[model samples]
Target: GTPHIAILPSPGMGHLIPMAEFAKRLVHHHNFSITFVIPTDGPPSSAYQQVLTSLPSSIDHIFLPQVDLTDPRIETLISLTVARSLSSLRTTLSSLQSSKNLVSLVVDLFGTDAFDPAIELGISPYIFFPSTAMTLSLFLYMPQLDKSVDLVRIPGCVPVRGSDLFDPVQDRTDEAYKWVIHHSNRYPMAEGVIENSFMELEHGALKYLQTVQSGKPPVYAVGPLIKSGSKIIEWLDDQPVGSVLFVSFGSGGTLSYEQMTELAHGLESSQQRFLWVVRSPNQIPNSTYFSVQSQKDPLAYLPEGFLNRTEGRGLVVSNWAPQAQILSHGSTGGFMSHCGWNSILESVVHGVPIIAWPLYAEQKMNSIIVVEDVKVALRPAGVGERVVERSEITAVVKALMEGEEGKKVRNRMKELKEAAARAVSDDGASTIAIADLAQKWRSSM
Candidate 1:
């Protein structure tokens, strides 16, 4: 019988891009019939549209009706909840049932509510966690987060006990956590979770997950799935090993004017051969540091004549670029990241060091793991309630780029990278987990 699967991804560029690559891999490498589901409005970028339009005819692309969260006619919270309900998800599933060979549903973790319908229909449902295992573990145990905890008392305060303190503010606002907790309770009765992280970077958390969750629902780490433009591989191929620094904030993360200025100064001071992905000016909120003049073009946000002064020393890309392939390239040395899980895995797999500049949510925690637990990344130097100043930003960047601390992180990252690659190779722990998950699905079905 031909195995068929429906892949539903989150409604963002970062999530959709990697999910599509995984779907393509399954179709090409495993011979599965695939249907890729996307929201009607699609991603914000024309580049994203170009990519989707280029998919092979063998794979199906389906778009759901657009549900605008910005509309005042609908209550934002209710609109989102209804949009994610099983009924809405079931409608999408029902449309695909006509294919008859449907055997599995692969969904983003945020859409776990759809699992109930998959169970009723006897079609397995697997969740895809786009974040790191560290983040996932934190989410699973998020209910235990106490606001009164001393670590979170102040803005810049981080937890001392664990790798980092659990910040619950984002949790209160994001409804997805409630859905995850509810679905996770169903445990063994559901399919399983497929994380986009390798075992080496999250061994302790993975072990804990297996021990605590009795359902023995297999966790498959089938990543680092990096999607880059045509030129990314070539660009990295030309770079020397451990000589370049790559800087990027994941999509959806925005920096305030103060934050952006500090970051620019930081990159300038680093004095390293670097490639920085600067967000479009209009993408962020207006402020004194970021004016309408600068919003018209990204270069306006850089330090005064920064590009001219730093010419031949740095390359700045105005929009999105291929991050994964860049990290994998030899000349690329270190990463200045927002601590996004996908970015973390990419760096780990490539054995590149990191300069963590965590923006929000579980990012600070992820940064702690990279810096404190893993010891392969460095954090900006500062102790304060607000964002780091330009001086501190520059100092931290310089240390990671040309100072002694940078060398230590580079060496450690090299070691960690080897370990990470081993964990995902044919005989690696992640490979074994994937095999085990395939077996479990077969048996359950």
Candidate 2:
């Protein structure tokens, strides 16, 4: 097996957690040496500390000096961070060339810009997509397909309109759109591609891309590579089966004050036992792992007395929680998520249903598949572009927690849970995919 692979993950738990797990997998299952390059502006927060400590001690992780990049908008801040990290990364990799074999580079999609440094170092480069299989399909095909149309159709994915596209692509003149266009343009030329997904969950999308991308380097779906059990698993043991709904927007997904209040009301109205991770709007940064260390009452911003009213049935965690731990708990029956690909994997793996409330990036698109295509989640009726009203949220919650719809969603997720397990097991499709990747990588070396 190839010994040294440098993995550059863009900042954020949704990206970093899966990338770290994937690196751990390579170390544990494939015998590859790994150096995980993390970009940080400051010391790790409590959530990041959890992930850092949880990783296998054998894997080496180094933080590149943080660049002073700031912006009012999330997209620009990320763009600048990727652009600025290049010089530091180039220097870091150059220094390591003498000591490490450094056969290949695995970069999160946000870190695709780092591949330029990989080429300068003359190492193979792979784009490790931390999003869903459906999003990956669009990323690989969007450049080649007809974007001029009002509704863009992608194989193995629900069609999306120009209006439904992300903030960047929907408004073609936006700078972020240009940035993404540039990145999408670069993907076909990469040495390889990796996705945090598995066969049964995304077979149609994967198969479509494989046959279509005949000349592109091998595409490996070697995942559901997500962080596993934590103390929250212990916490869930005291709760009853299927009585709880875990609510947290994945890292970086924030709600307006009105939205947050409405959500609080909805949770209170539903009468289901709930676990909520509440983040301050001002404190949300690029990654949820390094989220706000809230010194303030985590529940201070809530409608007055909301906490007191829900007293026995709800728990409000400030800023962050061990998300994977909660999802995997036996008593956890539903997830009210921002639809981050990593969270979807966690929820699916645990057989918990979803309440898809997409807030940013590709999350809205993921919500569509979970709610409409796969039926593993529920969304409010006529939920297009309007604020999710308290009534709507209350209705959706009751359906998922106490209604037949919840039962159906749970049963469907259990089937997916089994499939995801099989995908990572010996002789499974994803296991074989990664093995093939290792064999090819070693043979190339």
Candidate 3:
């Protein structure tokens, strides 16, 4: 009998997309089958719906019914939702084992606690680290380092200063602090860790992950798994080469009302051809997924006539934008991003430079790696505040889209794109990494 895999992605599109891609990779490249267990919790975003509909028919899916739970104050709201699924999840896994050839379990990093079920069921537990190698190293080192230290340093990675440390680590009082501490300890218990980062981009960071004490699991670097399909590129063809700026805050990031106003004026001042994906300000901070209510006048919050002023030059997507599709377009010269890891990969793979706006968690780390180490982005001149002055926004947008300084960064990104292409090809790092993982699975079976 063939080894079968089960993937448990957490509650958001950002987490689900890569898990599906990895599932598809196992099916196509490795000749395996996967049962993707999607958690039916909260309102599903349109992006989640799109991925759900587009899954390959060969891969089977089971959805855990949404659990009714209160948002607790002990940890993050994400933690509460996770806790509700535990008992039900164990029951589901037990039932599946009786019916199928379930060999191993792969869970997203946020849901590492689910490993307890994997342990109980006598199935192998693997963790998927969807962000960068650097961030993974931060989590792996969580127990040893004191977060109270003003400056946190990890081997072969950027040193995180007071404010830039992961939001969970910044203040011990925050409920999310416990969330980070708990997951950090939970991750090393897995049989292996799969990372969505290519080797070439993070060789140094990878080595640190490799050197963990006796408990270090194999770290698989198979990544840059970007989604495809692009109606937006057809519109991009109508615009001048390198003329457009693409703006969005990944699947769940949101700015304050005041911040959005400044950003609106900034885009208006830049006067560049732009596409902005927007929603109302977040009702809860650090909440990764939520549905946008229908906006009759989405831009009503903008200064009077601002939308009218930019009407011809800028296109505002009301609820969601086709981000991967848009970034792949040739005319998208610059990106204004929330520095989500998935968004960073999409922008870099398409040879686009970005203005980094990190909102939560390890996004600040993401911003630093791209802006400082990789040189693929620039930071918004105004930092540490909800509202960035319209002037800084205007200047940064122009610098990325039209200034000579950005051209070098843009040129560097082209080389990166080429390297990324090779990493996923037949003899490439990511391909080999996943192949190795498949072989390990077969051996274990």
Candidate 4:
């Protein structure tokens, strides 16, 4: 009988997209059939629907009915919804097993709740980490870490400032903080952990994960797995080679009103060509994570007359732009991005250097990896925590687009780009990882 695997991803396109891509790889290369289990609070967005439709017919999915997410804190809501959906998942897995040789169940970070259900069904459980291995190292080591320390050190990665860690950990009293600790404790119980990262990208962290002596599940760096994004294409064709900066925060990333104003002014003052994606300012940086804004045009919030001032030199598109097409453009030399893992991999693959402006959710740590460890990015002086002034933005943008340091970063990114391609090639590290995992599942059958 063919191996039937199940994958469960937490809410948010960030989690779902990467997990979906990993599922595609399994179906394509390993001859496995997948049952993708989605946990939703309400109706699916068009973007979510699109990813589902694009999946191969061999990949069937089950959407757990809506669960109440009344908690205002994003982390709490996600954890609660996933926790509440456990019984449904158990029922779904039970029914799925009756139809196929359901050998293993794979889950993302928040989806760890599904592990108990899988274990009860006699199915192997695996984790599909959607973030960097550097972040994962922090999670694996977090249970024993003292929160009061100013600098937190991981096994083989850069030491992150205590302030750079995510919100939940800073306040130990918060329920989210407890969940974070709880999830870390559960990670090692899995059959193996599959990360959406490659060996070259975070070799230090990956190496540490694989060689750890005990209390660790098998670690596989089987990624840079991204599913391959439009109309912003024509604009790039007209710009000169290596001339324009493509600026975007990942789908949910938002700037405060003060930050947004400074950004508009900064891009204007830079006097460099740019394609900026504008989202309405939010006091809460990750406010749009679950619900995207559609009624108001985000461009209206920009500094008045700012658009007219930079009309010919810059194009400010509202809400969304073609990220993949823009990054691959010859004219698009630098990216001013929110340092999300998916966005980082995309920028690296295209050989575009970054001006890292991280927001919420372990992004500050990711920024450290790129700007400090990887040396492929430059971060603004007061970004992530405080209001980054117009001058800071202008200075960093110029440094990445025109400075000597920018040239070095760009060249390093090109070398990294080549490394990324090799990692997923026929004999590459990522390919071998997927093959090894697939074999394990087959043997289980």
Candidate 5:
């Protein structure tokens, strides 16, 4: 009998997409059966539904019925939502174990507590760290670090100031901060940690994670696992080679009305071909976390008559666009992105340089890695809470498109793209890692 693996991903599209990609890999590449258990707040978003439908029929999926959480804070809501779903999760896991050859239970970072139930059920536990190895290193050490420390330094990774960690970690009193502490402590209990980044991209950070003295689980770099999106390809096909800049904050990222206006003007000012995915403006970065649909038109909020000014050279898409496909398109030479791990990997895999515009989560850390460490991206001014004025956006857009710095990063991105492809090839490190994991599970059974 083929071994079956149960995977539970937390709420967001960001977390769910990679888990789905991994499930596909497990089924297609490693010959394992998968039961994808999803925790939902309500009906799945159209974007979420799209990923679900695209998955192979060989992988069965179950959506845990909606859990109610009244907390408005994004982190608290997300953490509690998963915590509240444990009974449903436990029942699902128990039933699957009884009916099939259940070998392991896999969960994303936020789903750490799910390990305890799996452990109790005598199932192997694996966790997927869908962010960078640097982020992983930080999580592994955060439990030990004193709260008052000025800089949150990981031994072999970039040092980030305590203030720059993430929104939740900034305040000790917040429930979100306590949730972070709780999850960090639970990471080591897993049998294996599956990271969604290849070794070549984060050699130093991954090495630190692999060789740590603590009883950390074995780490595998099985990436760049990306979701497929096929929207608006025809629009990109008409644009010139490497001429368009693809602008999007990740699915949950949002901007203030001021920044949104500035972005509209900046694209007009840059005079470069662009494809911008516009969502309604909001002051809170994670306000759109669940991606609740609104009746208001996103384009209407853009600077009035802005569309007419840049008609042929620019395309302003409202609400959603196919980001993965857009980044891979021949017309895309640069990306103005929010620096989500998945988005970063997509940009690297497709050889597109970036304008780093980090919004929330660990995006600040991700931005630093790409712009400062990897040198494949440039940061725009007015990052963080400030509204990036049109002038700065214009200059950065030009720098990424036609300037000397643009050429340098473009070349660097090309090298990364080739490295990413090689890492995922049949004989590459990522492929070998997946095969090895599959072998261990089968042999143990």
Candidate 6:
């Protein structure tokens, strides 16, 4: 009988979609029976539907009841409540045990506390981290996050104090530091840490993680797992090389109406061929009106008559696109991104330069690593509670698309791209790592 695996990701677009792709690959490529768990609380975004439509019949998905984490009023209480809900989840698992094919459980790191239940049931439990290897390494050393050394006081500058111990690009914002401390304290029993990054791109960070966190489970790099979509690739290929600039803010990111309009004008002023994926406001249609009444059509949020002016020169995909594939196409030269880990890795893997415009969470930190540490991307102008205005956006885009700085970054990105590809190819480092993981799974069975 084929081994059966259960995959449960955190209820976010960035977390759930990649795990679902991994489950599909396991089922089809490795001959495993797979079950994917989706949370009811997850937004029904276009990208979610894209993932659902692509799953093969051999894999099964189960929708669990949504745990309420949406109440902005009780943000602190939400985390505590989430931790307490596992008892009920364990009961659900007990009831499902009669099915009897569950041999392993793959869960998001956020869900690591549930590992004990799997261990008790004689199932192997693995923790999946959907971030860069460098981020994971920093996370492993989170207990050592001293206030004086690790914290960042200035915008766009490296942490001055922790330069010797950690990456200079590491920014220790109050909320970011708190999150690291909380997660480090909560999920110490993770059997293994799985990251969605290739070793060649983050060799230094990977070494640091292994050295600093002895006895921690081995790190698994199974990534550049680009989700499949044909339309996005076709569109990008249709555009001119070094002309199209791809812009996306990832799944959950939102821009205020003013911010959105400024970005629109910026793209217009740059006069570059571009593709923008704008997530619709409110999970449901008509639940809320757009902030710009005059710009009733979401696409109109860009500069007035910009589309007509740049007709056939640009395309605005209203919802999600196969971002990784688009970035890989030969015509795509630069990206304007929110710096989500997945998006960052995809751009790195494909050799596309980036204009970093971080939105939330650890994104600002990730942007620092890309723009400052790596020197293969450009940072958005201005810092700290400052919005990137249209003029600044226009200037940055023009420089990236046509200036000498963009050329240097692009050349560097090409070298990094080759390295990333080598790390994942057959007989490469990541391939061996994945094989070792597969062997361990087989032995456990």
Q: Largest TM-score belongs to which candidate?
A: 4
Model 1: per-residue Cα lDDT over 200-268, one tens digit each: 566666666556445556667776655546665555566666777888653536666567777777677
Cα misplacement distance, residue 298 of candidate 3 (Å): 2.0
Q: Spell out the clash pairs found in candidate 6.
A: none
Q: Per-residue alpha-carbon lDDT of model 4 for 81-155, expressed as tens digits? A: 788999999999999999989999998776778899999999999998999998888878888785434567887
Which of the two, 5 or 6, has more lDDT?
5
Worst ten-residue run, lDDT, model 3?
283-292
Please list all clashing residue pairs in model 2, or write none if there are none: none
1-445 per-residue lDDT for model 6 (tens digits): 5566677666556787677766664554565666665544445577576676678877766656556654321222323343655665566566555564567778774565567677887878887877666556565556654533445333223452343222222455534345446666655566677777765555566665545456667777777655645676777778776788988754537776567777778888888888888764323223234444634355645556867876677777765777767786788889888788778877888889989887654676677767877777887686223677999989899889999989988888888888778877787666666666666666665
In model 3, what is the error at residue 52, expressed in angstroms?
Answer: 2.8
lDDT per residue for candidate 2 within 393-438, as digits (tens), equals 8999999998999889878888988998899889787788788778
The root-mean-square deviation over C-alpha atoms between each candidate and the true structure, in angstroms, is 4.8, 4.8, 4.4, 3.7, 3.8, 5.3
Model 6 is weakest, by summed lDDT over 10 consecutive residues, at: 71-80
Instruction: Please give the lDDT score at residue 235 for candidate 5.
Output: 81
What is the number of backbone collisions in each predicted candidate, taken in the order shown? 2, 0, 0, 0, 0, 0
State every prediction's TM-score relative to the real structure: 0.81, 0.87, 0.88, 0.93, 0.92, 0.81
lDDT of candidate 2? 0.75
Q: Report the CA-based lDDT of candidate 3 relative to the real structure.
A: 0.77
User: Which of the two, 3 or 4, has more lDDT?
Assistant: 4
- Per-residue lDDT tens digits of candidate 5, residues 1-445? 7798988877668887788888888788666788888877777788777777888987888888798764355667767777888899889999998877898998877778788778888889899888888888877777787453556677567778676776767777788777888888998898899999877688878888778456878999898998623446888888899999999753648888778889899889889999888887765335342443543667766666899989899988876788877887888989988888889988998989999998874888888888888789999886865788899999999999999999999998899889999998999888988998898778757
- Candidate 6 has a TM-score of 0.81
Candidate 5 all-Cα RMSD:
3.8
Instruction: Report, for every candidate in turn, its global Cα lDDT versus the true structure.
Output: 0.65, 0.75, 0.77, 0.85, 0.82, 0.67
Candidate 6, superposed: residue stretches over 4 Å from native? 38-53, 65-88, 91-101, 146-183, 212-214, 228-238, 249-252, 279-296, 383-385
Candidate order by lDDT, highest to lowest? 4, 5, 3, 2, 6, 1
